[PDB]
Amino acid sequence: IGLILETDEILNKKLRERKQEELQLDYNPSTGQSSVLILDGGMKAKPYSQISSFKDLDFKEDIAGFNKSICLAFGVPQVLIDGGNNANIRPNIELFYYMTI
Amino acid sequence: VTDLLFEGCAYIYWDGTSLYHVPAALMQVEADANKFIKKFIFNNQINYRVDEIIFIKDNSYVCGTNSQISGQSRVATVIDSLEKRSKMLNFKEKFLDNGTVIGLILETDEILNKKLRERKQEELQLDYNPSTGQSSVLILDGGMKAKPYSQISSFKDLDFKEDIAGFNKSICLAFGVPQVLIDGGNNANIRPNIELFYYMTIIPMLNKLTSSLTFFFGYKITPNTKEVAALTPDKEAEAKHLTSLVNNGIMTGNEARLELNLEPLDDEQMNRIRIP
Amino acid sequence: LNPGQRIIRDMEPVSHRTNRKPFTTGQAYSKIEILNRTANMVIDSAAECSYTVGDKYNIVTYANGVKTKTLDTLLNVRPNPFMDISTFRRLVVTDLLFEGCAYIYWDGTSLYHVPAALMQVEADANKFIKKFIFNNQINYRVDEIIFIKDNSYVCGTNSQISGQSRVATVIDSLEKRSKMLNFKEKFLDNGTVIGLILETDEILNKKLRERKQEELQLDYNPSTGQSSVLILDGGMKAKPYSQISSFKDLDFKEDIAGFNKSICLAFGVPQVLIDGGNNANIRPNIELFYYMTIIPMLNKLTSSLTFFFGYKITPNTKEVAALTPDKEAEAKHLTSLVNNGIMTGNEARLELNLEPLDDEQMNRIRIP
Amino acid sequence: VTDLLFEGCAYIYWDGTSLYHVPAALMQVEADANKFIKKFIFNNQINYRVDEIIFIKDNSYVCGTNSQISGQSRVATVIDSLEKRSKMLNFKEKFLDNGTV
Amino acid sequence: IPMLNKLTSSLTFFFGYKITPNTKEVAALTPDKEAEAKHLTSLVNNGIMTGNEARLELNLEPLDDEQMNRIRIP
């Protein structure tokens, strides 16, 4: 939601819908220029907040754990999934070959 | 290689003295009851005899049966991720076009002449912005109230960055190309990673192909990398390797010339071991 | 021949283009910096590889019987009486990259670039290709064209004949990035910056109110004026307010960086070449860029020329000043091979670009 | 080098035993129907014969056509940014003079 | 160097001579006095390069003593 406006009056539905589309196209900087808004006749702007946010879906470590489990069940080092430095890479191939295969 | 990667199979006709690629999407393999394969069917419209096709297949475990005959597509496992990532990217864009950016809210219980109200809005908008205009203090009279507000949903909460990075890693991993090749790193990173990519990913594919050709022709057949400019070893190490083996009488001179791509030289001594 | 050909022919009887959006692509290349730079780096780097002409295979071919010295002069020196070698190469590489195909006419003793956007390929029912159609207005015979194509997987068919455009995959990102940048600008011009709000229930003489606003504005700013305390009387109230939407929430920086990486990746140029790094970074990265990206392209081209002429043909990098090896290592390599009697002296002179010296010993191996 | 960088083209006359720079902003190239280039036109007011000019051009991809003859300016791609930066800097200054303390 | 290669390739097309740019006048590039001496000395003593070729690369006039234009084998 971008904005909430509120009244105790009853408003003509067709004109209300038109007004919503005018505000939406005018205020966005991509579409339109206008930015100040003047309310009259008692329309009130209602403050609100994002009651549930994408920020709380910090899955990132849990899925990483599952990837490690899968990678571990076969027994392939992560350096082979990434590629690292020389000192990492050349011994890890021998690790993978000798221990697993 | 396109057919082998995307479909998971490849077929080649042979015609005495010709090899022809045959599109893998149109072939079909029919199992024999006694031998391995009875015939190959193309587009349901022609049957190739078994001794006239060279057949290659990737691994296959299907519907809970380990599968002879069939081949798993490699690329088929990646599409799920390409969809989700595209969705996020489109959402990331479209939130901006659906956006709504307010600078100020003014409010009254009176009713105001609409045409003059619109003019006043345009005057305030052009005057207050520093780019357009100078004025900055605002004096309200007759009871217009300034209403405090807040951005009820913000772009800050679209921290997609790690999730899309995960999807890129998945795609990059399905082919099996190290990220150092997508970035470029330091020397110690870069030079071994090329050998990692070549030996682990490509050489098993070519071993599948060459083992099928050695089965068909019966010759020993195997791939040579040493034409590849990417792999070609360092001019320093190779010289000390070859020199030390040559002087200690393990390897003849012309064998070294050959390994350096040079024509053998017919001086007999060049095909002699030197003991000391 | 191939019994299936009559069927394959019907799967794709005529080529079709893949560089849709040609106009917006030409706009992008003409207007967006990172595309222009990366494309120019690729074209200008590939154009300066020399070609070496090798031995001749005995098999028969189309371009029969051409003497090696002529072919060498055409490839290395002068493609035709009217156009240089560098312009010819850059045109061919431009077509190969942008459209995904390249075509070259041959006319006894001339090679001419033919624009890839106007050619079309018609499949034969028995052989590979029947004829090439230019602008629907002239047909070239098959043994008079050299044809190159990039990979192609189209509409769920692996595609002979056709070629995928490389650049076509990048436009989606160039649009989105431009949108963000324009939004990033325009939010500033749509902005609104208030310094103070004063309020009354009385009604005030408009002309005097405007004068008072201009007096306060000029007086209070430290650049213009001195005064800083403010005394309000008669009931003017100062209304507290807050910035209801702030520039701080436009933290675009990583998203646009992602799009730059995508563009940079589509050509396959390492970021170290866009930045410049340390020596250990920089010197290997040039070899990475050359060998992985450019040399496969030139191998596509040279394999098509060896098919057409029948000579062995392959590209030589050793003219390239960027690649040319370190003066120290090369000397110890060559010296050690020469003294240990693996390589003759004149072979080393040759590798150092020096003319062979006719002293017989210079063409002898020295054993000790 | 100035002409080659800024305009994207450079032209040099030759006169037996003289080379003269010819300003790239005033030259124009006319395509031949059989050969490469028919003649060079200077300021619409003199035509140079083809064997009397040395011609250099940077890369060119224009209006969706890969372009012979023409050359892309290098510097032309930079102006968009120089404007925006200047705007920010001016705003950064003027906020201080519009200030109120 | 790509810019100058564009220019020189146009001049070689026009005149027909081989034409190419030399950097070695550029004071910025000019190599380190230590490395260059060991490079040149080692190539000269091992009989790959004649003496006057080294003088030339050091911007020195060739010296007319015949031996200076001879290879020394050992």
Numbering used by the authors:
A (entry chain B): 204 to 304
B (entry chain E): 103 to 378
C (entry chain D): 11 to 378
D (entry chain C): 103 to 203
E (entry chain C): 305 to 378
What does the original paper state about this entry?
The T5 family of viruses are tailed bacteriophages characterized by a long non-contractile tail. The bacteriophage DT57C is closely related to the paradigmal T5 phage, though it recognizes a different receptor (BtuB) and features highly divergent lateral tail fibers (LTF). We present a composite map determined by electron cryo-microscopy (cryo-EM) at resolutions ranging between 2.9 Å to 4.9 Å of the entire T5-like phage particle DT57C, and atomic models comprising its core structural proteins. Our results provide a complete atomic structure of a T5-like phage, provide insights into the process of DNA ejection as well as a structural basis for the design of engineered phages and future mechanistic studies.
The reconstruction of the capsid-tail interface, here referred to as the neck region, reached a resolution of 3.4 Å and revealed the presence of three proteins that enable the transition from capsid to the tail tube. The portal protein (PrtP) forms a dodecameric ring, which replaces one of the MCP pentamers of the capsid. The PrtP ring interacts directly with a ring of head completion protein (HCP), also dodecameric. The interface is completed by a hexameric ring of tail completion protein (TCP), which connects to the first trimeric ring of tail tube protein (TTP). At the HCP-TCP interface level, there is a steep reduction in the diameter of the density attributed to the DNA, suggesting that DNA is locked in the PrtP-HCP lumen through interactions with the DI of the HCP ring even before attachment of the tail to packed viral heads. Since the negatively charged DNA should experience significant repulsive force when passing through this region of the portal complex, the dynamic nature of the HCP DI β-hairpins may contribute towards preventing premature DNA release. Furthermore, our cryo-EM map resolved the secondary structure of the N-terminal part of the TMP as a trimeric α-helical coiled-coil. Second, we found that the neck tunnel at the HCP-TCP interface is open in the pre-ejection DNA state and remains open after DNA release.
